Ligand binder design. Structure first.
Ligand SMILES: Nc1nc2c(ncn2[C@@H]2O[C@@H]3COP(=O)(O)O[C@H]4[C@@H](O)[C@H](n5cnc6c(=O)[nH]c(N)nc65)O[C@@H]4COP(=O)(O)O[C@H]3[C@H]2O)c(=O)[nH]1
Ligand SMILES: Nc1nc2c(ncn2[C@@H]2O[C@@H]3COP(=O)(O)O[C@H]4[C@@H](O)[C@H](n5cnc6c(=O)[nH]c(N)nc65)O[C@@H]4COP(=O)(O)O[C@H]3[C@H]2O)c(=O)[nH]1
Ligand SMILES: [Mg+2]
Ligand SMILES: [Mg+2]
Ligand SMILES: [Mg+2]
Ligand SMILES: [Mg+2]
Lengths: 225, 247
């Protein structure tokens, strides 16, 4: 068992309290960018995912701790026939309210076969699980399906969060995502917040919550305290 | 289902209208505003009341655009009235639980006031006790924004939910509205008069105006006045009616 979760805080804007964490997988000390693609191609991602989901639910129970936890799903995990049985079973196993668990799938993953995403996410949403669309702005979305999917939040891609000059293309895109949130009834999370000016500007643009190194780096449950 | 199809097209068919009910200083003092109340003029069923279709609207999400239309028309009407010289009237608009939690609520209020050049102090937003107290920390963030814009905040159907006195003081509410259920039962239950008195006393000690709602009889009016209610609303003082008929 060399697999460990690190947790990164999500924080209500403007400076408001921490409302939850994202679980981030780690393995020397190996980062997931170095091995998740091999796991995806080989199918080992599905067992690793079962372990991640279980450990996140276990940790949340242990804490419960007035907050929720977000787990990432790769394209294979999202499409895997077992996914929805397994989410329901993991919440049942730990007697954990479904409102405490968030599942993140990327824009690309969700939009690849939107009708199939809809069958899967509708089940998940009827069970009460929070559904987040990650890396938003980096894929291709149908506005029609963006409304139809029972998502509760979009997470702005880290790639748009750099110098964020007021007249930048990046700022326009952040504004557009915020406006999608406002018109489609979705919370918007900015990810990759490293500086005070980003925090301030993203808050004024109307992001609902923030994640990034400035607010807290990923760390193991113990160090998080 | 017929109701579902019919409600979907109700805005397209201009079948939705606002009626307005006077709120009056107690006992019968000047009218200080109105509550906007949605009605549906149905070509087959006639004038349908919102208890008969707002739950379907909530469940389907049709309540969002129905609410945009309600807010727009209410703001239009208040503007018109202000320009007609009714300087001391406000208008109160109801918010369901879904509208109160909608990510765009505050932007939509700001846009509607700007569209009709309406000072924010002439708009009152009513959220029920239950709605406000379900997640009080979240209610606080929402209501503080609305209150900083200058919009009045009313806690509706008061007495029907469960309130934290702590958050009841922290919320930037301006008024509590006693639920009509407590007014109607006064002649038929000894507990109701105590409950109504307690609500009035909460207003007095937390610095909130109290509105008594559902006033139908002279004796209710007299009793509520003697208790010290600030304002009254009810059939005795004036039923909901269209803006024109109200005059
Ligand atoms: N430069 C910078 N980076 C920041 C900042 N704040 C957070 N990050 C990093 O950005 C990534 C956020 O996760 P992601 O976009 O979902 O993207 C994740 C996610 O797609 C994938 N991944 C991580 N854990 C899991 C997992 O348990 N399951 C699955 N299926 N995928 C995972 O690996 C990707 C990269 O993971 P990480 O290395 O942990 O990198 C994490 C996080 O450490 C910041 O302020 N500045
Ligand atoms: N028996 C009796 N009833 C009286 C008397 N005085 C006032 N009422 C009624 O009490 C209700 C007061 O509104 P509410 O408690 O906010 O309760 C409202 C409110 O929750 C909701 N509603 C109405 N319009 C709207 C709207 O535009 N948006 C939203 N979200 N909800 C609305 O529907 C509920 C019922 O609306 P209405 O049928 O118009 O019923 C109205 C009004 O007609 C009286 O003396 N006797
Ligand atoms: Mg993620
Ligand atoms: Mg991301
Ligand atoms: Mg009301
Ligand atoms: Mg009421």
């Amino acid at each position: 068992r060399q697999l460990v979760l690190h947790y990164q805080p999500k924080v209500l804007a403007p400076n408001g309290p921490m409302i939850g964490v994202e679980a981030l997988l780690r393995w020397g000390l190996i980062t997931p960018g170095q091995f998740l693609p091999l796991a995806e191609k080989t199918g080992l991602i599905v067992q690793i995912g079962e372990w991640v989901l279980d450990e996140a639910c276990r940790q949340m129970r242990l804490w419960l701790a007035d907050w929720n936890i977000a787990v990432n799903l790769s394209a294979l995990q999202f499409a895997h026939a077992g996914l929805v049985d397994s989410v329901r079973n993991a919440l049942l196993r730990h007697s954990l309210e479904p409102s405490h668990l968030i599942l993140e799938v990327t824009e690309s993953t969700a939009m690849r076969d939107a009708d199939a995403s809809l069958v899967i996410l509708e089940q998940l949403s009827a069970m009460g699980v929070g559904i987040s669309i990650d890396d938003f702005g980096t894929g291709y979305s149908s506005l029609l399906y963006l409304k139809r999917l029972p998502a509760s939040e979009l997470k702005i891609d880290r790639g748009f969060i750099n110098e964020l000059a007021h007249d930048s293309d990046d700022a326009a895109i952040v504004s557009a995502i915020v406006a999608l949130g406002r018109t489609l009834n979705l919370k918007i999370v900015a990810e990759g917040v490293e500086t005070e000016a980003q925090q301030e500007f993203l808050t004024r643009l109307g992001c609902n919550s923030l994640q990034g190194f400035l607010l807290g780096r990923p760390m193991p449950a113990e160090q998080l305290l």
